[PDB]
Amino acid sequence: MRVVLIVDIVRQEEKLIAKALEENKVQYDIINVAQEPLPFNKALGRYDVAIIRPVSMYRALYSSAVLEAAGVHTINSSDVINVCGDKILTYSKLYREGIPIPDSIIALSAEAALKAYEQRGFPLIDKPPIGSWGRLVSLIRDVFEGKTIIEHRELMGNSALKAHIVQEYIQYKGRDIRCIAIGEELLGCYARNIPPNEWRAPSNIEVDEKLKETVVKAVSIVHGEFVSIDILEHPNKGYVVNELNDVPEFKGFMVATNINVAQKLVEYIKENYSK
Amino acid sequence: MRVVLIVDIVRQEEKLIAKALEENKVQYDIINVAQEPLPFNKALGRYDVAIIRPVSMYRALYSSAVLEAAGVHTINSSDVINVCGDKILTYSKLYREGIPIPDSIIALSAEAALKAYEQRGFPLIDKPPIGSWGRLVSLIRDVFEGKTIIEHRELMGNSALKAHIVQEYIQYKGRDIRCIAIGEELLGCYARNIPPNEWRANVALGGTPSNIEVDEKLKETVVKAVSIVHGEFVSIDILEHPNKGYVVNELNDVPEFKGFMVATNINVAQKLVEYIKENYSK
Amino acid sequence: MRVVLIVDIVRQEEKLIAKALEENKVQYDIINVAQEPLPFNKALGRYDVAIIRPVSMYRALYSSAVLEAAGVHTINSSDVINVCGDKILTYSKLYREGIPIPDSIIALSAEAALKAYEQRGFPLIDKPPIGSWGRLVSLIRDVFEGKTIIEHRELMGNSALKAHIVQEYIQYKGRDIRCIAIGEELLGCYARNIPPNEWRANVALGGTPSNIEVDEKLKETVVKAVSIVHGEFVSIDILEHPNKGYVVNELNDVPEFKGFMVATNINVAQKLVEYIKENYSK
Amino acid sequence: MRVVLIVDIVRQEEKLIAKALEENKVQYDIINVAQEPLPFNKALGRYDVAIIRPVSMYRALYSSAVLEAAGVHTINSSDVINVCGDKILTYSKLYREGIPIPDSIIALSAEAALKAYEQRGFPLIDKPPIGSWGRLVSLIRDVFEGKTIIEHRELMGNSALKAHIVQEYIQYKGRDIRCIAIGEELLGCYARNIPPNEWRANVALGGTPSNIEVDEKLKETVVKAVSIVHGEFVSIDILEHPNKGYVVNELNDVPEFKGFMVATNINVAQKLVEYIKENYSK
Numbered sequence A: 001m002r003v004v005l006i007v008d009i010v011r012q013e014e015k016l017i018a019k020a021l022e023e024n025k026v027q028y029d030i031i032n033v034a035q036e037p038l039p040f041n042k043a044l045g046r047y048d049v050a051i052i053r054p055v056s057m058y059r060a061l062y063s064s065a066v067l068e069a070a071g072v073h074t075i076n077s078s079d080v081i082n083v084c085g086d087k088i089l090t091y092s093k094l095y096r097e098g099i100p101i102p103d104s105i106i107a108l109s110a111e112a113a114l115k116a117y118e119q120r121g122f123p124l125i126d127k128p129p130i131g132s133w134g135r136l137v138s139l140i141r142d143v144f145e146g147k148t149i150i151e152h153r154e155l156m157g158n159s160a161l162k163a164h165i166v167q168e169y170i171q172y173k174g175r176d177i178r179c180i181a182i183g184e185e186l187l188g189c190y191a192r193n194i195p196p197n198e199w200r201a202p203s204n205i206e207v208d209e210k211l212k213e214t215v216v217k218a219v220s221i222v223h224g225e226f227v228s229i230d231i232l233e234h235p236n237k238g239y240v241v242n243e244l245n246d247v248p249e250f251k252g253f254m255v256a257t258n259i260n261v262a263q264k265l266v267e268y269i270k271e272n273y274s275k
Numbered sequence B, C, D: 001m002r003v004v005l006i007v008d009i010v011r012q013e014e015k016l017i018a019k020a021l022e023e024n025k026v027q028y029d030i031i032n033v034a035q036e037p038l039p040f041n042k043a044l045g046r047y048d049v050a051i052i053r054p055v056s057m058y059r060a061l062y063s064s065a066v067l068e069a070a071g072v073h074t075i076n077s078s079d080v081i082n083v084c085g086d087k088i089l090t091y092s093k094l095y096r097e098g099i100p101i102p103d104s105i106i107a108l109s110a111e112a113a114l115k116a117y118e119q120r121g122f123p124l125i126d127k128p129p130i131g132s133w134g135r136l137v138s139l140i141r142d143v144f145e146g147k148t149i150i151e152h153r154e155l156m157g158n159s160a161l162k163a164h165i166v167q168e169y170i171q172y173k174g175r176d177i178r179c180i181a182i183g184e185e186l187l188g189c190y191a192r193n194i195p196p197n198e199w200r201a202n203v204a205l206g207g208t209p210s211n212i213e214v215d216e217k218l219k220e221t222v223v224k225a226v227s228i229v230h231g232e233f234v235s236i237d238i239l240e241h242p243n244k245g246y247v248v249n250e251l252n253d254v255p256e257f258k259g260f261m262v263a264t265n266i267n268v269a270q271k272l273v274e275y276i277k278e279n280y281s282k
């Protein structure tokens, strides 16, 4: 077996993954896609599998696609990256399967956004389908607030930042739950509590079964191989899926959970892509 | 059976589909997604089939995704819109199956782009993955031009534009060939010649549409390509290549067809509505 | 005397100005700066006066500047357009002279902005220095709202949008007052009332206009403000304040006047052309 | 006398200016405008002089303007920042006075840009009026390259980044000359040479910085330029020209000087502080 690790900005995660490959005696090399171009050639086919780690979605998407063209299986796959990287696409797969999500209405213009606000009532959450580190997630309390948010989103220099995901405002336990799965296997979860005085959110949490099931069904449906899952507790739904990440960070995960994520990843790869 | 026609900007094409639905006695609604929101609900499940027609790529993608959540059969589907809407994703699928494409190198940074230019030599073509009416398709003559184009695309606000498709510059037949397929069957093709003061063939620049005699090699290229990407109602842009015969350049997942109609005499909307009636009524 | 009329989008205003020039028998040409380039040359010196009417601020600024280079007297001048087109610059000049403005704090970063909010308390108005038809004028009710607004403006293409004007929220007469001055003489004023229910009175969708008796306090406020900015043909936007009486909100250096005319029955174009003849004929 | 030093990102230059103030026994405060908001008041009037050093134009412009509102003399002033920070406004002031500049044509749309190219002939330089470390300065060799550049600028698509300055391509001695002046006094000049694979001298990794003997024609050119813009502490970028001798390309209102300092051995900060004391002590 030989693996290629695809990176652009090498963080602790990619170092850990590199380190895990070496000491598990896996043949590998690194291609830095911030530095090297990717031909549509046939001899990238020398790798049995690629670990897709670029820090930007377009780099992850396109490097996976190029490697796929050469017959190389990528973790994660280009289709999975396209789904996890877009909340509307993620919500669509989950909703179809009956996996709970925050109650959501999609609006694709300023006019539609106001109508969605009106259909949903206040308070509500409005976020775009892309990015963004808690960015552009707005808690909207009345029509005046909505109208100014609509105007600000309209003037964003990006097209997908203009689609609105209009959601119920979930407030129950004041925390975000993040989990990591390798294949169908849940490694663990930790909780991120909302800081004072915010409305928006690091300790290990014991995973009850209701949580484990929510997470495992979510990964199965998006076909994820190495992903994180962000979960919100809901008073009636129990647990709803908020987000999947197809290039998950795990330094904050490793410290809360004690799980050697990198080791689990390389073991997984050995089991499934060796011969 | 009932159909939703999803639109934002109503063009001749959308009017034609609407009229074709009415004239074939198909129960249809139109939902304008530049005006109305789309809830993730069971209610839209009242539609058996959605005809996805927004002009904007994000609007086609998301309207299709929401309708799919409700169990509606979308033409085209969101995964298909995601692939067709992106030349790198399209080239990736096509290359894997050995369907000819233009020789392409993918560069995802300024540094990587310069390397691709040097690996390839000049002149070359550099274009982004998304689509732009031939906007941002650059004929790069040298390193200076490459560097300025790199610099410009870096500063544009949506990161897909940071990915450079660095391609062979095809010079041969002096035209673009555009075909349409319905349910993986070729309807017809036409050609749009490069106007005399350019090197791109787009309608947005020039060239009247003229019918093409589709040979067997061209027919099979189209069918194989549309089949691999699973497009149910697509157009396919093909370039004639000195060595490869026909290479697939683009697939469009919300195909234009008023130019295609004048060149080919084919009632595209009629054939679409027949195909839907025949395959999704029960 | 020869006049150039500089336009990009021809509105009723520009038609009116062309008519008034023609009807007063003034030699004029029109240059559309969305169509035609402007050389730094001495050729343009054939015009004695330029009337600067492009709808975009940058086109007004730049066309004025190129005309000034050739020695043409521009109305308004580029210096004046730079000042009037920017609320921070305008407020600075007025404040120095003791001309009342809304109480304002300027914040040039996310951190400064949060401090400004907490310094003045809520509700408050937050707007950028650069106009936008009452867009991006936000009524900020709390810290959560200010934080999201800050986050949004951080991510726009124009760095001027990152400067926050953090203002007292004026609630008194439920209207704006717009006046027009030519050569530092007041023509008149009218009012635009806040529609129920908005916090902004802009034409879109500011039903309804009405009229106002200009008292001496309002007249002098307008004259003083227009004189300090050196505006030769401007509109000025005034808010009636419970304590300060009249405060200056904005000057417009390419004033609209279609609505001013319906309200006041004043021939703004005629007054402009007579002013130019009286002062610039030689 | 007391000075306020206005900063946002403290670079060597700012540290050096702070140090010079300290060593020369000058009472001074620092206000970091990336951290603190700026009220309109009378209290900032405690400062006799403000040294405006924010790294971003909007912060320099707006901090200067607020300080001016309080009666504080700013180095440089808001009007000077507005002129120097915009090459069209700079070229306009210089051209009116007969100070040589690169032959320039301003175009304010895609359509005008192509007409400007045709008027200018090839090769030409096209750059926006707003700085960017040689960003978006394009060397255009024919109409195809021109067409793709126009397309890329249109998609920026913010700012004055849509306005084109279309210039003669100057190529004589393969270098840029940069000078610094305090008041009307020229401190000196150095050259930045174009690196083997370039047309710009900024420039990531290039611009090997040679010291340069200031002749009288150069000195006249620089002094006249600084006189017309009323700069108090500026850099001036000059190009050698076969027929014009020297032309002014740029002025900078927040000049960098660590590189200038090492090329000329001029203690810029010291000279600045000496000048402030000499002039603003009272």
Ligand SMILES: Nc1ncnc2c1ncn2[C@@H]1O[C@H](COP(=O)(O)OP(=O)(O)O)[C@@H](O)[C@H]1O
Pocket: A102, A125, A127, A130, A131, A132, A133, A134, A135, A137, A167, A168, A169, A170, A171, A175, A176, A199, A200, A201, A230, A242, A243
């Ligand atoms: N519908 C919602 N109800 C309550 N809180 C939410 C909701 N959506 C998002 N949040 C909060 O906002 C934060 C960021 O939202 P998220 O959807 O994760 O955007 P991003 O993808 O930028 O991180 C989450 O940590 C969560 O606390």
Ligand SMILES: Nc1ncnc2c1ncn2[C@@H]1O[C@H](COP(=O)(O)OP(=O)(O)O)[C@@H](O)[C@H]1O
Pocket: B102, B125, B127, B130, B131, B132, B133, B134, B135, B137, B167, B168, B169, B170, B171, B175, B176, B199, B200, B201, B202, B237, B249, B250
């Ligand atoms: N590799 C190439 N060689 C020659 N011509 C090309 C090449 N790529 C694109 N073109 C020309 O440029 C035009 C636009 O290209 P295209 O890839 O279709 O971009 P878009 O999807 O934005 O229209 C087409 O008409 C085609 O003639």
Ligand SMILES: Nc1ncnc2c1ncn2[C@@H]1O[C@H](COP(=O)(O)OP(=O)(O)O)[C@@H](O)[C@H]1O
Pocket: C102, C125, C127, C130, C131, C132, C133, C134, C135, C137, C167, C168, C169, C170, C171, C175, C176, C199, C200, C201, C202, C237, C249, C250
């Ligand atoms: N400080 C304020 N207090 C109350 N209302 C305001 C304030 N500032 C602006 N407004 C309202 O918002 C509208 C738009 O504000 P304005 O400053 O004129 O922005 P723009 O330059 O885009 O028109 C004004 O008509 C006025 O009614």
Ligand SMILES: Nc1ncnc2c1ncn2[C@@H]1O[C@H](COP(=O)(O)OP(=O)(O)O)[C@@H](O)[C@H]1O
Pocket: D102, D125, D127, D130, D131, D132, D133, D134, D135, D137, D167, D168, D169, D170, D171, D175, D176, D199, D200, D201, D202, D237, D249, D250
């Ligand atoms: N008209 C011109 N002719 C020749 N070289 C030019 C011309 N304009 C700019 N340059 C070159 O490009 C470089 C950057 O140009 P400049 O006008 O200074 O833009 P910026 O403000 O982004 O630095 C200059 O240092 C000079 O080398």
